[PDB]
């Protein structure tokens, strides 16, 4: 779509918009109101999914602050949708009954797939991405984090599986190191202290 | 002998620190870790996993 690949990303953010008395829902509603005002005017950390969400918030905040604060208007619309992405990730930051955020998660992952289609096939379809770094970067970044969210969320994952994988890799390298030592450097029957003297 | 007896009753901690702790559990692990990291190449296996 050339310069309307940005309109495709805008449609992705509109899909992100598709997805009570506590302060968190008030914060989400305030962020959505800020998205509405910006769009009409410009024209916790202890889980891996939380890491991706925080990252998304940070990146997309820098994105809005690098494009909107700093078919030409699609370059501002696709960056205005980054605040909707940040609102969705701050909603999922407390993922609070999970059934409230389940549909938000489904819309988030579906439009992350749509952005990871549009922006990924954008260079091969004619348009160029390398031109504007501070504009073009954060949408690719949030699409990446969105996809790895649909991988770290869909399968439970958590820090437990990360620690288990790190321990398995270190354990296999440990047995390789012990075999290498006992076979080439010094036999463990020579290195250790023979008891029963 | 009286002064040695008095000083041996006074100290009672520094002697264990200097006879058990100071080399084997304070200085020698530091020395071997620093020596290994100074010796082995800048490799993930040799710098983290093998030590």
């Amino acid at each position: 779509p050339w310069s309307s690949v940005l309109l495709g990303c805008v449609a992705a953010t509109y899909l992100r918009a598709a997805g009570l008395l506590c302060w968190r829902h008030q914060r989400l509603a305030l962020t959505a109101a800020a998205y509405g005002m910006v769009a009409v005017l410009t024209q916790s950390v202890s889980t891996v999914a939380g890491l991706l969400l925080t990252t998304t918030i940070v990146v997309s905040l820098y994105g809005l602050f690098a494009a909107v604060f700093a078919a030409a208007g699609l370059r501002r619309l696709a960056a205005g949708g980054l605040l909707l992405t940040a609102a969705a990730s701050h909603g999922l930051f407390d993922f609070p009954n999970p059934t409230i955020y389940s549909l938000l998660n489904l819309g988030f992952v579906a439009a992350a797939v749509l952005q990871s289609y549009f922006l990924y096939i954008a260079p091969a379809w004619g348009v160029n991405v390398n031109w504007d770094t501070a504009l073009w970067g954060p949408m690719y970044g949030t699409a990446f984090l969105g996809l790895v969210y649909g991988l770290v969320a869909l399968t439970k994952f958590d820090w437990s599986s990360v620690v288990d994988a790190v321990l398995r890799v270190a354990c296999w390298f440990a047995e390789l190191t012990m075999w290498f030592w006992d076979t080439f450097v010094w036999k463990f029957s020579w290195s250790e202290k023979t008891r029963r003297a | 002998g009286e002064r040695i007896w008095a000083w041996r009753n006074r100290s009672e901690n520094e002697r264990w620190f200097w006879e058990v702790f100071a080399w084997d559990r304070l200085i020698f692990p530091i020395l071997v870790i620093v020596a290994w990291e100074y010796l082995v190449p800048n490799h993930l296996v040799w710098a983290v996993l093998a030590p």
Binding site: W186, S191, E192, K193 | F21, D24, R25, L26, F28, P29, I30, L31, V32, V34, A35, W36, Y38, L39
Partner: peptide, 25 residues
């Protein structure tokens, strides 16, 4: 928790850790 932030002796099992000192020196 209930233990101190102190090392463990490496000469309780092998003398091989003593090989690093002269080689590094």
């Amino acid at each position: 928790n209930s233990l101190y932030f102190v090392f463990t002796q490496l000469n309780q099992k092998t003398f091989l850790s003593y090989w690093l000192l002269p080689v590094a020196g």
